[PDB]
RNA sequence: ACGAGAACAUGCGCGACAUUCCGAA
């Protein structure tokens, strides 16, 4: 058996969706630094009781229920910050593109409180980057990642020019490396096979839609701010919020000038409110698209294998 | 007829799943999950099985010797007897944080890329269970190469997973033997 | 259970476009309950575990944790406040508190799951 | 008889689609409350039984939420409204006789397969 | 002063042997 040891260096922000959402109420967010502390609720309401204000956050909670910021409530009480770090699981980085804290969906972490990214989950993007019954390639989870590293980064759209969304996925700060073991074969799948397949596809998905971006005025400005290393070279995009086109087999399968016509249609079918209304073919389909000023690209990510 | 107890650990690496009758294994009495010995052994058996048919009793001689044959005219004993392994009361209170996880999938369709989200309850890593396995010395000289053949299993086990999707990030087990005695006899 | 009048005043039809969903409130979703349905599926969990004829702290205290996050999804959206509001599942979890016993709280589990499981059905 | 009559009414597939595994859950929850009740010596049913009666009636409006060919097995075969009537009567001889309904009722299911 | 009187249907014997709740996302 084949056993190589996997790295993955996040270049861009990547969020892997937990399968849960929370607003302002389960963590602290301070606006004047920007930065959002994920607190646990038990540990908030024993606090609130020892101190006597558990009734207070309910009636603050009674009118405040769409907005009800924890942050802003602990201000109100004046209460001391050192408390405030003590009942705090951990703290992490906020980057805005534009604003507070409204609707975060949570990183996927393990049960013990560390955070890490699934196997599942590179499974599914090796699968679908390939083609265009997977039972020998056997892919494990990922080594937990700093706490501190993980920050809650801004997702934002560039339909031929950026714009940030309100939508905040808490994706994993730039220059952090996670480990695999992966164990295959040598009778039905090659890494040099694979990975060299893997870069083909990102190649040409680069071709013949990010080169529309480049050539748009929106493009340009992320080339000039750095969303692209020079490096982009085996990349994948593993996190939610890439976009549709990343890693996909029916744009490897269908040639050029006509897969992005089923790409149309098949976002049209996707979208119908946003796609559907729109009917002509852009010259890129699909047209949409950090605290320092390099720019990143949502899920980047780079490959590197040790057999 | 030498009786050697196998007793130790096996901590889990990833999510560990087996799937029960999405739940997981666990003891009725305790409500804590378990490893089954009838996966480990079904676990250790395939794969040393792999390593050296359709009744699934032809195998090679040394598979019969140690997990046992059913053969029509040659039934041999099974030599290795693998228990159902508990989760450890040492793993239960580092945990006094949720014994069991519920991971989502969202399984997205390729033609329709239309997602169909699943749930899987796996244990969290870091949990361990406290096996037991026991040797049965039929002939004493074939004992060292049987042990030899129990060894090679365990690594692949440790190389392989335990139960559930194994290729998505779960099962993955690590083996700590603790003592290795002739209980009974004088072996 | 006496929870089959609550959910049968609590279920409603709705038709649109030629579609007929039969939902009890336009916005009782399987998976916006589910996070509280969790909840106590973790607090009981615990419970069982424990195996104890009171109510634990700690249980006390995920519970606790539970009525804010019942509070929560009353402000999320207006249709599990009106659930809330018809079950009056507040009074059941201070009884729980109150009485501290393990009894009243699997009592209230079951009638809770019952509630659920009626919705369920009459969808 | 009636259980005969209702699985023949239900033949055609029996049930929309019913198969002993979707029925298990509520095979195991009715042996195991008739195997309480059989180990007591007394007439009229308990508290703690009449509980797990409970209990059961909402495990069967459970599985028919879940399953059509269950909704229309308990539609079809009167298992709720039964147990309902153990729980009213509260005499033990009605639930052994209920028991003994469900039985027959799985059993020409199974024979009508 | 009963076709009667004395006479264990009893001794030995594992419902046991092989079987991953797994592939797929």
């Given at each position: 058996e084949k056993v190589y040891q996997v790295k993955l260096k996040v270049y861009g922000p990547v969020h892997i969706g937990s399968g849960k959402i929370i607003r302002k109420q389960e963590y602290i967010y301070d606006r004047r630094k920007s930065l959002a502390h994920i607190v646990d609720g038990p540990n908030l309401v024993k606090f609130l009781n020892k101190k006597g204000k558990f009734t207070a956050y309910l009636q603050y909670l009674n009118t405040t229920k769409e907005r009800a910021d924890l942050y802003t409530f602990l201000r109100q009480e004046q209460i001391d910050?050192?408390?405030?770090?003590?009942?705090?699981?951990?703290?992490?980085?906020?980057?805005?593109?534009?604003?507070?804290?409204?609707?975060?969906?949570?990183?996927?972490?393990?049960?013990?409180?560390?955070?890490?990214?699934?196997?599942?989950?590179?499974?599914?993007?090796?699968?679908?980057?390939?083609?265009?019954?997977?039972?020998?390639?056997?892919?494990?989870?990922?080594?937990?990642?700093?706490?501190?590293?993980?920050?809650?980064?801004?997702?934002?759209?560039?339909?031929?020019?950026?714009?940030?969304?309100?939508?905040?996925?808490?994706?994993?700060?730039?220059?952090?490396?996670?480990?695999?073991?992966?164990?295959?074969?040598?009778?039905?799948?090659?890494?040099?096979?694979?990975?060299?397949?893997?870069?083909?596809?990102?190649?040409?998905?680069?071709?013949?839609?990010?080169?529309?971006?480049?050539?748009?005025?929106?493009?340009?400005?992320?080339?000039?701010?750095?969303?692209?290393?020079?490096?982009?070279?085996?990349?994948?995009?593993?996190?939610?919020?890439?976009?549709?086109?990343?890693?996909?087999?029916?744009?490897?399968?269908?040639?050029?000038?006509?897969?992005?016509?089923?790409?149309?249609?098949?976002?049209?079918?996707?979208?119908?409110?946003?796609?559907?209304?729109?009917?002509?073919?852009?010259?890129?389909?699909?047209?949409?698209?950090?605290?320092?000023?390099?720019?990143?690209?949502?899920?980047?990510?780079?490959?590197?294998?040790?057999? | 007829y030498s009786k050697i107890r196998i007793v130790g650990k096996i901590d889990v690496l990833t999510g560990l799943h087996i799937g029960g009758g999405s739940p997981v294994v666990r003891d009725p009495y305790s409500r804590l999950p378990i490893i089954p010995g009838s996966s480990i052994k079904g676990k250790m058996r395939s794969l040393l099985a792999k390593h050296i048919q359709k009744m699934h009793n032809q195998d090679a001689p040394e598979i019969l010797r140690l997990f046992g044959s059913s053969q029509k005219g040659a039934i041999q004993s099974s030599r290795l007897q693998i228990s159902d392994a508990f989760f450890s009361k040492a793993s239960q209170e580092e945990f006094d944080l949720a014994y069991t996880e519920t991971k989502f999938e969202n399984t997205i369709s390729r033609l329709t890329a239309v997602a169909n989200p699943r749930q899987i309850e796996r244990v969290t890593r870091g949990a361990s269970f406290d096996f037991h396995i026991i040797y049965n010395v039929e002939n004493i000289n074939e004992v060292m190469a049987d042990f030899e053949n129990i060894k090679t299993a365990i690594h692949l086990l440790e190389n392989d997973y335990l139960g559930g999707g194994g290729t998505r990030g779960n099962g993955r087990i690590r083996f700590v033997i603790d003592s290795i005695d002739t209980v009974v006899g004088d072996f | 259970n006496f929870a089959r009048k609550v959910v049968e005043e609590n279920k409603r039809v709705k038709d649109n476009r030629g579609r007929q969903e039969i939902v009890l409130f336009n916005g009782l979703t399987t998976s916006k309950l589910r996070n509280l349905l969790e909840l106590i599926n973790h607090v009981y969990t615990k419970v069982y575990n424990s195996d104890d004829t009171t109510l634990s702290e700690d249980v006390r205290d995920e519970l606790e944790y539970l009525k804010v996050k019942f509070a929560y999804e009353s402000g999320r959206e207006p249709a599990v406040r009106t659930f809330i509001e018809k079950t009056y599942v507040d009074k059941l979890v201070d009884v729980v508190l109150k009485k501290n016993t393990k009894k009243i709280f699997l009592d209230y589990c079951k009638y809770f799951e019952a509630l659920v499981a009626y919705a369920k059905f009459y969808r």
């Open positions: 910050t050192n408390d405030w770090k003590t009942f705090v699981l951990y703290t992490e980085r906020v980057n805005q593109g534009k604003k507070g804290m409204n609707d975060l969906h949570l990183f996927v972490r393990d049960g013990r409180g560390d955070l890490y990214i699934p196997g599942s989950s590179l499974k599914g993007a090796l699968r679908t980057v390939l083609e265009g019954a997977f039972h020998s390639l056997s892919i494990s989870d990922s080594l937990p990642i700093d706490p501190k590293n993980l920050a809650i980064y801004q997702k934002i759209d560039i339909n031929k020019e950026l714009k940030p969304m309100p939508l905040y996925r808490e994706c994993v700060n730039v220059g952090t490396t996670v480990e695999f073991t992966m164990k295959i074969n040598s009778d039905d799948w090659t890494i040099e096979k694979i990975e060299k397949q893997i870069q083909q596809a990102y190649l040409q998905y680069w071709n013949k839609w990010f080169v529309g971006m480049v050539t748009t005025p929106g493009g340009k400005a992320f080339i000039k701010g750095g969303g692209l290393p020079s490096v982009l070279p085996t990349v994948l995009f593993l996190g939610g919020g890439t976009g549709f086109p990343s890693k996909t087999t029916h744009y490897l399968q269908k040639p050029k000038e006509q897969a992005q016509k089923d790409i149309f249609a098949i976002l049209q079918r996707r979208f119908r409110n946003v796609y559907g209304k729109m009917a002509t073919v852009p010259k890129n389909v699909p047209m949409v698209l950090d605290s320092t000023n390099k720019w990143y690209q949502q899920g980047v990510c780079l490959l590197e294998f040790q057999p | - | -």
